[PDB]
Design a protein around this ligand. Sequence first.
Ligand SMILES: CC(C)(COP(=O)(O)OP(=O)(O)OC[C@H]1O[C@@H](n2cnc3c(N)ncnc32)[C@H](O)[C@@H]1OP(=O)(O)O)[C@@H](O)C(=O)NCCC(=O)NCCS
Ligand SMILES: CC(C)(COP(=O)(O)OP(=O)(O)OC[C@H]1O[C@@H](n2cnc3c(N)ncnc32)[C@H](O)[C@@H]1OP(=O)(O)O)[C@@H](O)C(=O)NCCC(=O)NCCS
Lengths: 206, 201
Amino acid sequence: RMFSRIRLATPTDVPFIHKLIHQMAVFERLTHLFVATESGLASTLFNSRPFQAVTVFLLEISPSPFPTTHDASSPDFTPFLETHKVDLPIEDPDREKFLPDKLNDVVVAGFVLFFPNYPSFLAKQGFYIEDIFMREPYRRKGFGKLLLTAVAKQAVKLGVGRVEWIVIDWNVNAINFYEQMGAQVFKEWRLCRLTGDALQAIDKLN
Amino acid sequence: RMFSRIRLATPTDVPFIHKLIHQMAVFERLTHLFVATESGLASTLFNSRPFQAVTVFLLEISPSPFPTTDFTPFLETHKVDLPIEDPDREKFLPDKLNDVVVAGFVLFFPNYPSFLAKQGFYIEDIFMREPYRRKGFGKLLLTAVAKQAVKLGVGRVEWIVIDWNVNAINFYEQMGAQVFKEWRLCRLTGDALQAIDKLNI
Ligand SMILES: CC(C)(COP(=O)(O)OP(=O)(O)OC[C@H]1O[C@@H](n2cnc3c(N)ncnc32)[C@H](O)[C@@H]1OP(=O)(O)O)[C@@H](O)C(=O)NCCC(=O)NCCS
Ligand SMILES: CC(C)(COP(=O)(O)OP(=O)(O)OC[C@H]1O[C@@H](n2cnc3c(N)ncnc32)[C@H](O)[C@@H]1OP(=O)(O)O)[C@@H](O)C(=O)NCCC(=O)NCCS
């Protein structure tokens, strides 16, 4: 029997966020683009109230109950706490890198990083999910479903009209998860990008 | 000679923004998804400072110079080859008695290229009305966004395109954008979100 908590990330979680994004870059065959540093994440992730700009939920797992929220401090968000019967003991070789406190038995298992977007045809704010990821030892136990559900629940609270993200078409396992969650994966849309260098080249135009 | 100005939108520009998004929906053959109202735009576009959240630049054209000018409007001038026939002109005048016409727009907001660990921008809409295309104005709109990006330390700008929109793809590539083959868009609709929210966690 296992316990999960979905909570907002704080500055103390930067090492875990950094490592999770790195794992994403490995999976997406894009380590050459991964230049993120802990210092860069610390400088950019926590300069607004949650949900108004870039926001992170972390999913934690423990064999012990978490402290109960009892009385909320937050106007917007209280952690989601759930109990689980999993059919298999978890072998997690990276556990030591994902402990918020090395003296407590709470492990960061996954995350979602998202921010407001704007579906213009609706004239409403939405959310965009930039990252959603469960570390390998914790997959196929319903945890990814909970991370996505947490975003949806916050979206409803805030009157969000749509959530979007992107996927590499060759990421079959992720696509299957998204489809089983009720997402549509479009055939026709393509991503366009101006890199930092491309931006500099335009800025030098007379 | 024609003169252009790229400026921030304000609440009085909502009619023009609404009509521009409608034209985008017609162009994209997605009018069935177009349910934006002027009311909705007014309530959602102007709740934060420019560049902190959803932001709109409008491109205006005039045969006369504009009054002398975080953000100052971008002003440009050149000699257009031949006169412009704009049948919708009367719907795009911020002042019905002055010769300044809204010709296009870009609607964008901060995003977060996580592999860079810094903010970027996403362009939700970039559009020139048909009478004003192929005259360099789209280039000016995208240039304005890129210049503001560099000023603010933005790491990357992204947007999406339909695969068979070869003319837009050509424009984007001419401006130095990469148009990727491998990425696909994923979506949960508002109704889907409501249903998912029935799970009491
Ligand atoms: C996409 C991702 C976030 C999903 O996270 P997850 O924790 O595995 O997701 P869940 O366990 O909630 O759902 C997985 C599936 O289990 C099933 N499932 C749902 N609830 C479940 C539960 N309580 N117990 C068991 N299975 C469950 C469903 O079939 C669900 O959909 P899918 O099989 O089509 O994917 C995760 O796989 C990931 O980070 N992937 C990126 C890396 C990757 O995909 N690598 C390639 C692997 S081959
Ligand atoms: C048209 C649009 C792509 C660009 O705006 P624009 O003002 O027309 O673009 P510019 O005049 O700045 O074009 C700059 C360069 O991009 C390329 N380009 C622009 N529009 C092009 C088109 N329709 N076909 C091919 N190349 C094009 C050219 O190289 C052009 O330079 P040139 O005119 O000296 O050859 C876009 O902003 C728009 O609103 N289009 C409507 C929706 C759409 O996707 N249309 C596609 C066909 S109109």
